Amino acid sequence: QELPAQVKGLAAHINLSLSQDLAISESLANSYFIEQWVREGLPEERQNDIAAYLARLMEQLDTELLFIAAQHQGRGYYFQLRNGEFLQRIIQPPGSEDDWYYHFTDSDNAYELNLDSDTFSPDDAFVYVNYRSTVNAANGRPLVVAGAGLDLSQMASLIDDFRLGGSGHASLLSAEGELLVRSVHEATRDGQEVLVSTIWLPELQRYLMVEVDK
Amino acid sequence: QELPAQVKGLAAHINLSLSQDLAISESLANSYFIEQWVREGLPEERQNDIAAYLARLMEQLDTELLFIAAQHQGRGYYFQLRNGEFLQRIIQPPGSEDDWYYHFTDSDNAYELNLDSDTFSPDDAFVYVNYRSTVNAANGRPLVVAGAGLDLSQMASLIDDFRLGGSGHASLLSAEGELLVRSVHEATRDGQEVLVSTIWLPELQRYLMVEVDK
Ligand code: HPA
Numbered sequence: 001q002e003l004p005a006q007v008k009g010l011a012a013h014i015n016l017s018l019s020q021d022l023a024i025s026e027s028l029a030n031s032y033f034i035e036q037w038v039r040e041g042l043p044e045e046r047q048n049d050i051a052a053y054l055a056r057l058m059e060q061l062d063t064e065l066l067f068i069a070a071q072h073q074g075r076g077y078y079f080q081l082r083n084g085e086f087l088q089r090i091i092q093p094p095g096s097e098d099d100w101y102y103h104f105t106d107s108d109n110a111y112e113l114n115l116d117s118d119t120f121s122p123d124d125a126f127v128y129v130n131y132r133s134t135v136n137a138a139n140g141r142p143l144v145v146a147g148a149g150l151d152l153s154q155m156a157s158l159i160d161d162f163r164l165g166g167s168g169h170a171s172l173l174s175a176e177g178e179l180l181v182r183s184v185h186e187a188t189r190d191g192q193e194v195l196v197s198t199i200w201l202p203e204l205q206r207y208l209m210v211e212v213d214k
Numbered sequence: 215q216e217l218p219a220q221v222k223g224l225a226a227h228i229n230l231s232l233s234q235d236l237a238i239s240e241s242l243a244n245s246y247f248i249e250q251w252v253r254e255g256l257p258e259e260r261q262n263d264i265a266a267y268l269a270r271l272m273e274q275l276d277t278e279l280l281f282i283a284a285q286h287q288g289r290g291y292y293f294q295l296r297n298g299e300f301l302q303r304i305i306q307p308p309g310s311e312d313d314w315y316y317h318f319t320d321s322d323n324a325y326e327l328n329l330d331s332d333t334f335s336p337d338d339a340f341v342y343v344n345y346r347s348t349v350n351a352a353n354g355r356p357l358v359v360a361g362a363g364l365d366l367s368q369m370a371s372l373i374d375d376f377r378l379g380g381s382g383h384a385s386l387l388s389a390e391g392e393l394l395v396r397s398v399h400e401a402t403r404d405g406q407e408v409l410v411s412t413i414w415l416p417e418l419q420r421y422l423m424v425e426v427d428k
Pocket residue numbers: 067100101114115116117118119128129130149
């Protein structure tokens with residue numbers, strides 16, 4: 001049985017690629033310079049430097065979106081670097097699009113990979129690598145929640161990174177069954193039966209299915 | 215054959231653990247805030263903030279040593295955070311202990327994992343994760359070479375992280391044959407013959423051997 005051992009290895013490669021972004025999101029959320037910028041009152045004069053700082057990370061991670069959600073004086077600020085634009089806005093109450101923040105910050109999870117539509121551009125859905133800072137604000141919420149918004153097309157190129165025989169389909173599913181991206185048991189299907197192998201990705205908290213017959 | 219597939223997976227786990235430190239070393243070497251501190255003339259008043267910044271990384275990476283080698287006005291500065299001490303010195307000419315720097319900076323390699331004795335404490339040998347910055351100084355050398363110095367005892371605990379049956383020995387060798395750490399072919403040996411499996415680690419550029427008989 002070559003494929004089940006093959007699937008675990010290629011899943012580990014996806015896991016390694018995700019772990020890169022996870023480590024960078026962790027370091028960004030707990031960056032002493034970012035915390036200093038937050039406690040300074042988030043002065044706009046330093047925004048350019050912050051953007052360059054995020055740009056340096058964006059170039060290494062090769063992710064389209066980077067975000068920083070910070071708490072100062074009890075107010076939430078959402079920053080995003082994308083396509084060279086540094087956007088900023090105030091985090092909305094839980095009744096609005098920013099309820100993901102209240103959800104993640106109310107969870108004891110250090111990180112979640114939530115798929116959601118961009119609050120600056122509702123036309124684009126990304127998978128957001130929310131990582132919370134170790135330091136909490138005076139209101140109990142994480143002082144910083146920073147991470148990377150991954151373009152779904154990247155997820156497509158990264159699962160067809162390794163292809164068995166150049167054909168077949170690989171699929172990644174949410175824990176609720178929501179399909180996120182598309183490139184041992186016997187199943188029957190339209191256009192001849194196919195055999196399936198699936199494994200759970202811990203660092204992604206998502207399931208990976210891939211089918212090859214012949 | 216369970217063990218050869220087992221060895222590749224556990225080698226990938228070692229590779230994943232190393233890739234964490236590699237990504238952090240890359241982000242640190244190309245940190246815009248570090249570059250700004252270097253071009254500012256490396257003012258001593260900001261050293262405390264720099265140390266806290268490195269401390270935040272050291273806590274996440276769980277590596278004992280962090281270093282920053284910077285070029286300003288044609289002079290090399292070596293900084294190290296270890297055990298809460300922020301040490302600084304001037305990089306010595308190629309005839310002295312700092313020739314590793316001239317070697318790595320003369321290579322076109324973005325990173326090397328060189329094992330060497332600490333220049334601040336010659337009693338302790340570490341494996342240094344030298345990562346060079348994308349920006350170069352006016353003299354042609356990398357503006358920053360930053361990374362983590364890993365305690366060799368960590369390397370020991372990370373190879374016995376996963377143990378087949380709780381016994382056996384795992385060994386990691388340099389490309390020149392220098393043994394770095396200790397926890398498909400038939401070989402004979404003192405105290406009964408043993409069977410060996412070896413694989414090359416790309417992100418570590420080192421070979422991994424592990425023996426189990428019965
Ligand atoms: O969950 C999210 N939704 C929208 N924008 C975001 N930025 C980080 N996480 C999110």
